[PDB]
Nucleic acid binder design. Sequence first.
DNA 1: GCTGATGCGTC
DNA 2: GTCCGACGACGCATCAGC
DNA 3: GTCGGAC
Length: 562
Amino acid sequence: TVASHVPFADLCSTLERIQKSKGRAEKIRHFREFLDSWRKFHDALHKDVTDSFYPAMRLILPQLERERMAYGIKETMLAKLYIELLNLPRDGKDALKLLNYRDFAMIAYFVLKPRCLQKGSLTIQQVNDLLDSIASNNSAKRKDLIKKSLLQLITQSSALEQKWLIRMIIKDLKLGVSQQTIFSVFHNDAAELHNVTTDLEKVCRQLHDPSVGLSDISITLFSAFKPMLAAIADIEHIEKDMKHQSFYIETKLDGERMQMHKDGDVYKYFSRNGYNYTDQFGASPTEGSLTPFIHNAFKADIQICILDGEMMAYNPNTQTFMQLQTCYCVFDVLMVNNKKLGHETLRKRYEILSSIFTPIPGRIEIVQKTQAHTKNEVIDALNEAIDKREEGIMVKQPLSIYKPDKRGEGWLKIKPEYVSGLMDELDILIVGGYWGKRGGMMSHFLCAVAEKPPKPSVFHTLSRVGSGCTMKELYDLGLKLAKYWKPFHRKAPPSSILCGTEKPEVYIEPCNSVIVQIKAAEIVPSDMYKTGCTLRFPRIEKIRDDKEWHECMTLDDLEQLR
DNA sequence: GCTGATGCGTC
DNA sequence: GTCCGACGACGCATCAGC
DNA sequence: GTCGGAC
Ligand SMILES: *P(=O)(O)OC[C@H]1O[C@@H](n2cnc3c(N)ncnc32)[C@H](O)[C@@H]1O
């Protein structure tokens, strides 16, 4: 194998040459120099071949390391680890410079310059093996061995080789060249293949010959693909960006992005960046937080499947999602049995997705898709979504295919525009409530502002806001206020709360109530509230226990804000 | 059993 | 307009010391 | 995820 015959110092030399290079091309040139040399050596050495550039690549692009588990080490633990071995003074200057560095690599390089041995004898593979050892020992929760392995690494290397090793352990090289540049240099199809593998060794083994190339590249089973993303659409321009044809509107979830590979009783789960969570959601119907519950959800004719969706936390008590059990909400299928669905239209994918399994509420579901045409519908969807305490809405082309790691390209996400100023902090009082349509708690609150006192007494309603119970602090707030709600009588209202056209279902006297910090996009004129204005896209950012009920912002503050 | 420190991967 | 590299929040995990 | 700089 090649990695056994190549000194780590040469790699470090290349990395140094790349780092100190000013322009995009020189960097590319030095890399090319190294890579070409490596390939030549490979050709010479091997004359069945599993060997490839991977042992180098994984060091060159350590952020793409997958096979090796986490090191369990960052700058501080490394400083703590290093200071012990060299036996530096505990309180000494060097140790102090290490300890608080705020470029840890460089600072560590200058400290080890006089201390380190003349120079290192280790190859790339040895380094790989020792790093493997560290990761493994970390996974096994034994530090005593980690110390040993790292010590072996330190003893056999030059200062420069370790500044690089450190930067490989931190998994940031700071070369000044993007990974796609590296990939473009290595092979023309490298990026394309990495996007549907997220396996550096796969990429390095398959594409080894720069002249040769792959035929059909696409989603595989048990191979992590970089999920398709959504660009931010801009406001009014939407109608033109959807092709003017019919389009899907669906809800914008805050879960985590998770894709599920299934064969029979065997399962694999991958995250956004291609990390394997299978230990969590489980590899089999007998283990994990998810798979056991969803195993019988699938239809009998389903053998092999690939799904992409948003993993959510579902409260069985309240029948809602909390930003208690793990729930997998699935918006796409890239594979079913012997058929690869990746190239089929979104419509077809939804059509198939509906048929592969039966929803289990709170365990596994299908995202709701609202077919739409007109901008007004999008607007309505946004404004309605915010009262559910969503973050926005999603809009998609029914005819668009799945394009891994492509932001935009048929997927759009709409959020409201929020100012970075005080329009994101308005501390205002809950003076009212409405009941949800289940719906056994307050769905929305009615919120108000006060007038400048010589406590206050009279309040003027400002805006409604969706109170739906999606975080604990909302339910707790709900519970705390139960005893204090009173039925609102339109013919005989309370004098403490002055209301416009909009009247609540129940009120609460301000002294028993709570201040909420509400962000909003902006203040607009309204005939429905006493202030004569309301909040566009209001949401509750925080509940305030640091503020008493009398601390509510006045009409003067609001007038100042508008 | 508790708690602050430190790592890891996410949106 | 595009790429892309610093940012910060969160939840969750261990674990040393009390 | 968002931001803001270099092209
Ligand atoms: P916001 O910009 O905070 O979130 C956007 C990302 O959320 C994920 N996502 C949520 N809901 C969906 C749906 N329905 N389809 C696809 N992706 C979804 C994506 O990762 C967004 O980029």
